[PDB]
Structure formats: structure tokens, C-alpha cells
Design an enzyme around this catalytic site. Structure first.
Site, PDB file in Angstrom:
ATOM      1  N   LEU A   1       0.823  -1.107   0.121  1.00  0.00           N
ATOM      2  CA  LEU A   1       0.199   0.022   0.113  1.00  0.00           C
ATOM      3  C   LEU A   1       0.938   1.175   0.088  1.00  0.00           C
ATOM      4  O   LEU A   1       0.478   2.277  -0.359  1.00  0.00           O
ATOM      5  CB  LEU A   1      -0.937   0.062   1.068  1.00  0.00           C
ATOM      6  CG  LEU A   1      -2.080  -1.016   1.309  1.00  0.00           C
ATOM      7  CD1 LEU A   1      -3.041  -0.537   2.533  1.00  0.00           C
ATOM      8  CD2 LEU A   1      -3.021  -0.772   0.168  1.00  0.00           C
ATOM      9  N   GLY A   2       1.831   1.322   0.352  1.00  0.00           N
ATOM     10  CA  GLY A   2       3.056   2.361   0.521  1.00  0.00           C
ATOM     11  C   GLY A   2       4.270   1.880   1.361  1.00  0.00           C
ATOM     12  O   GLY A   2       4.155   1.127   1.980  1.00  0.00           O
ATOM     13  N   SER A   3       5.146   2.773   1.311  1.00  0.00           N
ATOM     14  CA  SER A   3       6.339   2.734   2.163  1.00  0.00           C
ATOM     15  C   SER A   3       6.663   3.962   2.878  1.00  0.00           C
ATOM     16  O   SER A   3       5.883   4.501   3.073  1.00  0.00           O
ATOM     17  CB  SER A   3       7.599   2.246   1.207  1.00  0.00           C
ATOM     18  OG  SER A   3       8.121   3.224   0.510  1.00  0.00           O
ATOM     19  N   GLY A   4       7.559   3.882   3.802  1.00  0.00           N
ATOM     20  CA  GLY A   4       8.029   5.194   4.107  1.00  0.00           C
ATOM     21  C   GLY A   4       9.592   5.168   4.532  1.00  0.00           C
ATOM     22  O   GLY A   4      10.265   4.637   3.437  1.00  0.00           O
ATOM     23  N   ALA A   5      10.192   5.647   5.420  1.00  0.00           N
ATOM     24  CA  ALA A   5      11.560   5.897   5.842  1.00  0.00           C
ATOM     25  C   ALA A   5      12.207   4.774   6.621  1.00  0.00           C
ATOM     26  O   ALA A   5      13.385   4.662   6.636  1.00  0.00           O
ATOM     27  CB  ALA A   5      11.898   7.184   6.472  1.00  0.00           C
ATOM     28  N   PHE A   6      11.290   3.982   7.401  1.00  0.00           N
ATOM     29  CA  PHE A   6      11.742   3.015   8.237  1.00  0.00           C
ATOM     30  C   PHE A   6      11.174   1.695   7.935  1.00  0.00           C
ATOM     31  O   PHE A   6      11.234   0.597   8.494  1.00  0.00           O
ATOM     32  CB  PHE A   6      11.636   3.363   9.638  1.00  0.00           C
ATOM     33  CG  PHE A   6      12.190   4.671   9.883  1.00  0.00           C
ATOM     34  CD1 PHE A   6      13.309   4.985   9.819  1.00  0.00           C
ATOM     35  CD2 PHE A   6      11.368   5.810  10.217  1.00  0.00           C
ATOM     36  CE1 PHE A   6      14.089   6.332  10.167  1.00  0.00           C
ATOM     37  CE2 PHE A   6      11.464   7.057  10.669  1.00  0.00           C
ATOM     38  CZ  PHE A   6      12.790   7.278  10.704  1.00  0.00           C
ATOM     39  N   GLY A   7       9.954   1.737   7.077  1.00  0.00           N
ATOM     40  CA  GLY A   7       9.276   0.407   6.649  1.00  0.00           C
ATOM     41  C   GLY A   7       8.069   0.572   5.716  1.00  0.00           C
ATOM     42  O   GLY A   7       7.904   1.804   5.102  1.00  0.00           O
TER      43      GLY A   7
ATOM     44  N   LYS B   1       2.793  -2.809   9.098  1.00  0.00           N
ATOM     45  CA  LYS B   1       4.009  -1.904   8.790  1.00  0.00           C
ATOM     46  C   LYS B   1       5.448  -2.990   9.103  1.00  0.00           C
ATOM     47  O   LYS B   1       5.575  -3.151  10.200  1.00  0.00           O
ATOM     48  CB  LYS B   1       4.196  -0.783   9.400  1.00  0.00           C
ATOM     49  CG  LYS B   1       5.058   0.380   8.970  1.00  0.00           C
ATOM     50  CD  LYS B   1       6.013   0.727   9.753  1.00  0.00           C
ATOM     51  CE  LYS B   1       5.662   1.682  10.864  1.00  0.00           C
ATOM     52  NZ  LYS B   1       4.597   2.623  10.189  1.00  0.00           N
TER      53      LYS B   1
ATOM     54  N   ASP C   1       7.154  13.551  12.785  1.00  0.00           N
ATOM     55  CA  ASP C   1       7.242  13.726  11.617  1.00  0.00           C
ATOM     56  C   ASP C   1       5.821  13.971  11.263  1.00  0.00           C
ATOM     57  O   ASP C   1       4.940  13.126  10.400  1.00  0.00           O
ATOM     58  CB  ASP C   1       7.537  12.225  11.128  1.00  0.00           C
ATOM     59  CG  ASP C   1       7.726  12.151   9.429  1.00  0.00           C
ATOM     60  OD1 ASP C   1       7.552  13.114   8.890  1.00  0.00           O
ATOM     61  OD2 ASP C   1       7.749  10.753   9.125  1.00  0.00           O
TER      62      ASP C   1
ATOM     63  N   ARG D   1       1.250  13.655   4.409  1.00  0.00           N
ATOM     64  CA  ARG D   1       1.122  12.245   4.161  1.00  0.00           C
ATOM     65  C   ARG D   1       1.256  11.394   5.448  1.00  0.00           C
ATOM     66  O   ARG D   1       0.670  10.081   5.106  1.00  0.00           O
ATOM     67  CB  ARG D   1       2.819  12.034   3.440  1.00  0.00           C
ATOM     68  CG  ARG D   1       3.718  12.230   4.484  1.00  0.00           C
ATOM     69  CD  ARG D   1       5.282  12.140   3.680  1.00  0.00           C
ATOM     70  NE  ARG D   1       6.355  12.268   4.942  1.00  0.00           N
ATOM     71  CZ  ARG D   1       6.654  13.769   4.661  1.00  0.00           C
ATOM     72  NH1 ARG D   1       6.327  14.582   4.061  1.00  0.00           N
ATOM     73  NH2 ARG D   1       7.774  13.719   5.839  1.00  0.00           N
ATOM     74  N   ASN D   2       1.478  11.740   6.381  1.00  0.00           N
ATOM     75  CA  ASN D   2       1.211  10.859   7.665  1.00  0.00           C
ATOM     76  C   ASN D   2      -0.286  11.218   8.501  1.00  0.00           C
ATOM     77  O   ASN D   2      -0.124  11.021   9.759  1.00  0.00           O
ATOM     78  CB  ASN D   2       2.487  11.269   8.759  1.00  0.00           C
ATOM     79  CG  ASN D   2       3.845  10.327   8.064  1.00  0.00           C
ATOM     80  OD1 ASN D   2       3.759   9.366   7.341  1.00  0.00           O
ATOM     81  ND2 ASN D   2       4.898  10.960   8.578  1.00  0.00           N
TER      82      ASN D   2
ATOM     83  N   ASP E   1       2.180   7.326  12.211  1.00  0.00           N
ATOM     84  CA  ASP E   1       3.586   7.276  12.096  1.00  0.00           C
ATOM     85  C   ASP E   1       4.424   7.875  13.049  1.00  0.00           C
ATOM     86  O   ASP E   1       5.113   9.006  13.003  1.00  0.00           O
ATOM     87  CB  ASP E   1       4.203   7.597  10.737  1.00  0.00           C
ATOM     88  CG  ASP E   1       5.631   7.093  10.505  1.00  0.00           C
ATOM     89  OD1 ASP E   1       5.860   5.972  10.359  1.00  0.00           O
ATOM     90  OD2 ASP E   1       6.618   7.951  10.439  1.00  0.00           O
TER      91      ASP E   1
END
Ligand SMILES: Cc1cc2cc(n1)-c1cnn(C)c1OCCC[C@@H](C)CN1/C(=N/C2=O)Nc2ccc(CN3CCN(C)CC3)cc21
Length: 294
Positions: free
Chosen positions: A19-25, A46, A138, A142-143, A156
Site C-alpha cells: 500500500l506504500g512505504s516510508g523511511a523505516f518501513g 508495517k 514527522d 502524508r502521515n 507514524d
């Protein structure tokens, strides 16, 4: 205390779609199958991209026992965790996505009453994190998750252990100082993202150079739909004196004032053609997706 974080077996949930990613997962749409039951319940999962150790995992379980402790309608609560070779975090699923993508995709259909209400709700959740001595680090559009179009929640939160320079307050970039007031700076930038219908802040300005343009007195410009009343508030979030930034409790009240007469404060073309859902349509969402108190 630890009664809010459920430890899960690999065999009682499944990852089905990215569904999407991030910076740590990376975040997956998942399914929760309780032991001895035949139901399959949609979750959000996640998976942490970097693989941790057995003692790295006591550190994780300490912020995971806190992350599971938030009891606030406008903040997403961690529900469960699965301690693999890449720790997997279980939470409630939001099929509508994040508020950032939603505003880009529905920009021609968003009226002033929705936007001002989201900012009320976002600041209510953040004022809760302040009340809980929890600095997010953060906050960005987007979060922010969309439960229903009339209800958003923040997600997040838990990344100091593990950089969005264009959202960080000046003192974070220079000194790594993160306080509730630097989250106010992140908040003002998130409001900018909403009011511009998902524009990227400082587009074309390299992140390595932003701390400089901020020190020279440059800020994000006034969004075309914003009256000066709204922009001044945003400008007050980006004051170099952190203590001079507004508090979340004051951001709540003022945006509440603006939500009671939204068309005075945001000038959107065709704003008279889009209103909040009737109490019929508000009850329809709430009985189906959104049964919590507020
Ligand atoms: C409690 C909870 C729930 C959720 C996320 C988090 N936390 C969380 C926690 N940390 N972080 C960084 C988080 O957000 C991840 C970033 C993107 C996120 C919005 C994904 N996302 C989603 N998130 C959650 O459920 N629901 C979504 C529904 C639709 C789409 C778009 N389609 C998907 C398929 N591809 C083709 C693109 C089109 C994306 C969706």
C-alpha cells in the site's frame, strides 16, 4: 499498561498487498485470523525495512507499549506487534488513504468546510500528543490518515529511535531539538499542504539548503485559496522563536472559529457547490466505519 499491545503470531495474520512505504518501513494491507475462528479481518501492517536483534527488540517494545497507549479519536493507536526478523506492527486499516493523496485527488471537490475541520481535528490530535508529552517528529500531510472524509487521524509516531527537512523547524535542522513547538512548525507546513491541494513545499529548493533560506527570513508563500487570516496563523508557526509559535490548544480554538463560517476565511472557486454531508450521511459513515466517540 501492556494490556493494549497484543503480541501476534506469524500464523495469525497475512500480508496481501503493498500500500506504500516510508523511511523505516513498508505498509501492507493485511488480514487478521484469530485462533480457532473462521473470520478474516482487514488490518494495516508495517514491516520494518531494517532487520533488528533480540535486544533491539526490547527497545522497540518500549516505544511500542507507549504507541499502543494513545487513546484519542484523532490519533491512530498501535494495536499489535509481531516480533520477526523484521518487526511487524499491526494497526487499524484506513481504506481512504492518507490526507495528502486525498486532497490531490479530490481538489476540485473540496470545500472550505472540510479543510478547516481537518485542521481543527489535526490540531486536536497533536494537542493530545502534547498532553501526552509525546513529540511526534514527522507530522506531514502524508502521515495523516483519512478514516472517513469527515474524520482524520495522525499516524507514524515512533521514529526518534530510527529526515523530512522541509517539515522540520529551524532548530531541529540546526540542533536536532524536537519539542512540542517544533511540531507546531511541522503543523503549519501540513496546513500549507492541505490548503495548496497537495503541493510540495519548497519545490525545487534542495533540502540541504533550506536551513539557510529559513534563516534569511524566507517562508512558504500564501496559498491562493487562503485569506490573510489563515496565512498569518501559518506564518506564526514558522517563527524562529519556538516559544512564539502558537500552541496546539490555540490552533484548535482559532480553526474552530474559522470552521463556523468557513467561506469568510478560505476563498475556493465553486465553494457553494460542496458542503459537509447531511446528518443522514454523517450517521451513515459512522455506523459503518467510524463508531468511536468523536
Ligand atoms: C494505522 C495506519 C494505517 C495505514 C497506514 C499507517 N498507519 C502508516 C503508519 N506509518 N506510515 C508511514 C503509514 O502510512 C503509510 C503511507 C501511505 C499510506 C497512506 C498507505 N495507505 C493506507 N494506509 C494505512 O492503512 N491506506 C491506503 C489506501 C489506499 C492507498 C493507495 N492505493 C494503494 C495501492 N497502490 C497502488 C497505491 C494506491 C494507500 C493507502
Amino acid at each position: 499498561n501492556q494490556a493494549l499491545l497484543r503480541i501476534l503470531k506469524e500464523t495469525e495474520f497475512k500480508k496481501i498487498k503493498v500500500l506504500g512505504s516510508g523511511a523505516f518501513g513498508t505498509v501492507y494491507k493485511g488480514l487478521w485470523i484469530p485462533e480457532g475462528e473462521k473470520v478474516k479481518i482487514p488490518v494495516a501492517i508495517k514491516e520494518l525495512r531494517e532487520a533488528t536483534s533480540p535486544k533491539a527488540n526490547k527497545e522497540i517494545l518500549d516505544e511500542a507499549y507507549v504507541m499502543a497507549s494513545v487513546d484519542n479519536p484523532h490519533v491512530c493507536r498501535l494495536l499489535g506487534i509481531c516480533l520477526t526478523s523484521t518487526v511487524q506492527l499491526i494497526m487499524q486499516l484506513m481504506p481512504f488513504g492518507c490526507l495528502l493523496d486525498y486532497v490531490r485527488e479530490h481538489k476540485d471537490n473540496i470545500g472550505s468546510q472540510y479543510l478547516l475541520n481537518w485542521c481543527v481535528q489535526i490540531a486536536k490530535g497533536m494537542n493530545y500528543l502534547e498532553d501526552r508529552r509525546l513529540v511526534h517528529r514527522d507530522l506531514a500531510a502524508r502521515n495523516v490518515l483519512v478514516k472517513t472524509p469527515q474524520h482524520v487521524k495522525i499516524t507514524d509516531f515512533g521514529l526518534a529511535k530510527l529526515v523530512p527537512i522541509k517539515w522540520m523547524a529551524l532548530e531541529s535542522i540546526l540542533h536536532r531539538i524536537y519539542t512540542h513547538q517544533s511540531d507546531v512548525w511541522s503543523y503549519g507546513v501540513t496546513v500549507w499542504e492541505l490548503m495548496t491541494f497537495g503541493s510540495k513545499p519548497y519545490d525545487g529548493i534542495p533540502a540541504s539548503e533550506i536551513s539557510s533560506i529559513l534563516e534569511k527570513g524566507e517562508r512558504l508563500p500564501q496559498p491562493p485559496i487562503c485569506t490573510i487570516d489563515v496565512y498569518m496563523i501559518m506564518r506564526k508557526c514558522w517563527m524562529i522563536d519556538a516559544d512564539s509559535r502558537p500552541k496546539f490548544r490555540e490552533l484548535i480554538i482559532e480553526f474552530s472559529k474559522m470552521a463556523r463560517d468557513p467561506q469568510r476565511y478560505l476563498v475556493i472557486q465553486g465553494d457553494e457547490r460542496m458542503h459537509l454531508p447531511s446528518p443522514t450521511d454523517s450517521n451513515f459513515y459512522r455506523a459503518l466505519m467510524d463508531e468511536e466517540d468523536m
